[PDB]
Amino acid sequence: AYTNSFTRGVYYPDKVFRSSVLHSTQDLFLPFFSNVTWFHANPVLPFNDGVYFASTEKSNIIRGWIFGTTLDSKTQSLLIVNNATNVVIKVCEFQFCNDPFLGVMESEFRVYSSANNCTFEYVSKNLREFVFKNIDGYFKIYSKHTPINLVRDLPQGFSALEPLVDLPIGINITRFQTLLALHRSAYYVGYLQPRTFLLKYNENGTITDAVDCALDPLSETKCTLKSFTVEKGIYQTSNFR
Amino acid sequence: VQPTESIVRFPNITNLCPFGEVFNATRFASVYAWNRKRISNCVADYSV
Amino acid sequence: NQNAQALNTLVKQLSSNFGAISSVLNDILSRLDPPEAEVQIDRLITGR
Amino acid sequence: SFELLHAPATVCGPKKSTNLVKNKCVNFNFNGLTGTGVLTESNKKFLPFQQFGRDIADTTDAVRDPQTLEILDITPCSFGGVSVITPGTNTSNQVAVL
Amino acid sequence: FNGLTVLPPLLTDEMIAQYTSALLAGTITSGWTFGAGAALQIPFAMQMA
Ligand SMILES: *[C@@H]1O[C@H](CO)[C@@H](O)[C@H](O)[C@H]1NC(C)=O
Ligand SMILES: *[C@@H]1O[C@H](CO)[C@@H](O)[C@H](O)[C@H]1NC(C)=O
């Protein structure tokens, strides 16, 4: 089905610290009060410039992501998994099957069968959320974890996402998939676009609130004044062309 | 006042591009069939 | 408020390239020799 | 056999660091950012993904050295005008400087 | 900042406060007489009259 991304999908745009300035940024963000999907636990989805991703369960049934362009051999791809604690990242060719997953019977196999000329390796209720952005040869990943009590419902709250890793490849990515863990015998997807936001920092370089300028006239009024409070009066904001 | 001098500081030195397994290998190959081991993200010390 | 806003605008006007390659006197100098960096320096001077 | 690919550069040599100096006027450079000023310890808190600070008016004021992972703050070195106080050459030639 | 300097005012705030206090004392005690020369004392009730 569908649900509405209320005020989620905000990440730190850079490594810069600010004490109390309300900083306005022009970058890729998920629009406020946007339309997102209601997947249950799954098919393949496109990977336009940016994507959102949120998961929420008490049982670890969701594990890792699969990225690439054709999701077959002959095309470079990105793979992330976590068996129990060893996070594995691979950026190289693979041959994924029609039903890749890992059961927890209690067997755990059947994701892919291929390994050749591989260019990188690495070994390392609750709400989980990730933002994936691939630009100019780099791959950005942001994360945040917030304990909740809702079973499988998207909550009402604001939380910034901190950068996690970054890796240089210089490839083009168009589609991606996901793994699961059900048996052997619950996630969200959002789409990013160029927008304009102003952020709030409280003496510790932590993003506590944000306002999307293009949402409604009040928001662009706040953006013009560069303040979260507006006094009585009339203000000029833009033009009707 | 004028600055006394210029100082530069950079992070520690990471994985060292293990040339030691290419210049001190136990057995090289014949010229008609030569290895093509390639390096990747790491710090290379050409001074040594 | 007006004095502070005017001074802040004057400060913010420094971070503008004015159609040049950059808005810093160093990076323009450090990557281009005087013969063609002089044009960029002139544009920055005119804007400021 | 080196090469230059459209992909970002990944492999290259070690940058030669030098000893940091505090409470003097020097020309700092940490991972690309460069300028002058006085280096001093700052009672601030950063986040493990946060390199340097920028205050109001978009100025670099705090930087964390990438050797000790501690925050330092930078302030411009002393600048100011010089004024001359004189009683007039018709009276005396003594001069006070402010 | 980068070349910006804020000069301090010549008359510090307590000095201006002292001017204001002197003006108030003169107005209360001598009425308008001190504005034309030497201050001439007069009871406040008669000045209001
Ligand atoms: C999201 O879009 C679908 C069709 O694309 C629509 O049926 C649904 O009502 C939309 N959700 C919201 C919250 O507008
Ligand atoms: C922000 O920092 C102050 C001290 O600098 C601290 O008291 C406060 O708890 C911090 N806020 C957080 C961590 O949300």
Ligand SMILES: *[C@@H]1O[C@H](CO)[C@@H](O)[C@H](O)[C@H]1NC(C)=O
């Ligand atoms: C200025 O100079 C003239 C002639 O030298 C002299 O008569 C006069 O007293 C001087 N006045 C002052 C204030 O120095």
